[PDB]
């Protein structure tokens, strides 16, 4: 069980995705739940310090974004080409 | 699939007719029936036809798969062709032989009027 603070991600593309990763952030997404896809910004090393536990993937977690809070489940990951660091991650509505 | 071999022979013909466009006469038969239809110069619809389904033939013929029933359709489609004034009509045999009931239909269509 976890609760994390997220922010709606409003600027997308390669150089912006690399910019986040230099400025303590990284891209992610929320989809499913019979609702439209949402793009989000997360803390780069602080979520990497969190996801290395089974209870991040075996059970739901809360995301706090857009002035509400919702439960999701972790769906997918992209790792760095030669490092365990987070490049991009997927979530699905729970 | 010996049924599909007749469809292959029809693909051969359909491709060969595709470069012609225009008004087309298609003949089709089965062990109890025979019919002939005139397809429009846009290919999208029929104009006129003749078929062993009409009680004008089907009540007078003792079997609709007969030679004289094929001639009855030939003599009807030629008569309806004269009503709609069709010329330069390309013939199509639906993958069948021309010999037999399609020839016996055509032989009588050129007896009810112009060739055909």
């Amino acid at each position: 069980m976890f609760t994390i603070n997220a922010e709606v991600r409003k600027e997308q593309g390669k150089g912006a995705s690399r910019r986040l990763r230099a400025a303590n952030k990284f891209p992610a997404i929320i989809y499913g739940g019979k609702e439209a896809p949402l793009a989000i910004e997360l803390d780069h090393d602080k979520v990497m310090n969190m996801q290395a536990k089974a209870e991040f993937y075996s059970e739901v977690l809360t995301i706090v974004v857009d002035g509400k809070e919702i439960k999701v489940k972790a769906q997918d990951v992209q790792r760095h080409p030669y490092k365990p660091k987070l490049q991009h991650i997927d979530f699905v509505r729970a | 699939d010996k049924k599909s071999a007749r469809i292959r022979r029809a693909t051969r013909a359909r491709r060969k007719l595709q470069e012609l466009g225009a008004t087309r006469l298609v003949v089709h038969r089965t062990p109890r029936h025979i019919y002939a239809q005139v397809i429009a110069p846009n290919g999208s619809e029929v104009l006129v036809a003749a078929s062993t389904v009409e009680k004008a033939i089907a009540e007078q013929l003792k079997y609709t798969g007969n030679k004289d029933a094929a001639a009855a359709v030939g003599k009807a489609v030629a008569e309806r062709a004269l009503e709609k004034g069709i010329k330069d009509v390309s013939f199509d045999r639906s993958g069948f032989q021309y010999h037999g009931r399609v020839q016996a239909l055509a032989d009588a269509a050129r007896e009810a009027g112009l060739q055909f």
Partner: protein, 136 residues
């Protein structure tokens, strides 16, 4: 000793390395090595590195190898001038880049590639080291 299957054609072209290509997910085991750099790897180097591990691991495992020689190289006499031409095949080589895992392990708990890799890294290019299994 490692001597790959005779090439369909008598000679090959060496080719350029892009110096990245992800391949970090272990599929012949659960753990492996860190590459994090780029260069050329030879058949004698991977057999000398296999010898270094064979001497420390005895017969445990085995260990699986995801790098194999890709090209034979043409070699000729040193005195031949510049111009004509390419010699016969001599040594076999491959290319390495940061995303490589090189070697894959699972059946060798804590006695290989868990505390150090220095003894096998001393036989190889690009100052390599071990990696821990990726589980999340």
């Amino acid at each position: 000793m490692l001597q790959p299957k005779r090439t369909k054609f008598r000679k090959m072209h060496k080719g350029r390395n892009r110096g990245l290509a992800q391949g970090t997910d272990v599929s012949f085991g659960s753990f492996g090595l860190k590459a994090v750099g780029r260069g050329r790897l030879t058949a004698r180097q991977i057999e000398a590195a296999r010898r270094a591990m064979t001497r420390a691991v005895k017969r445990q495992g085995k260990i699986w190898i995801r790098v194999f020689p890709d090209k034979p190289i043409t070699e000729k006499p040193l005195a031949v001038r510049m111009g004509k031409g390419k010699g016969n095949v001599e040594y076999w080589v491959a290319l390495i880049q940061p995303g490589k895992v090189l070697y894959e392990m699972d059946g060798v708990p804590e006695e290989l590639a868990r505390e150090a890799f220095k003894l096998a890294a001393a036989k190889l290019p690009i100052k390599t080291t071990f990696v821990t299994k990726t589980v999340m």
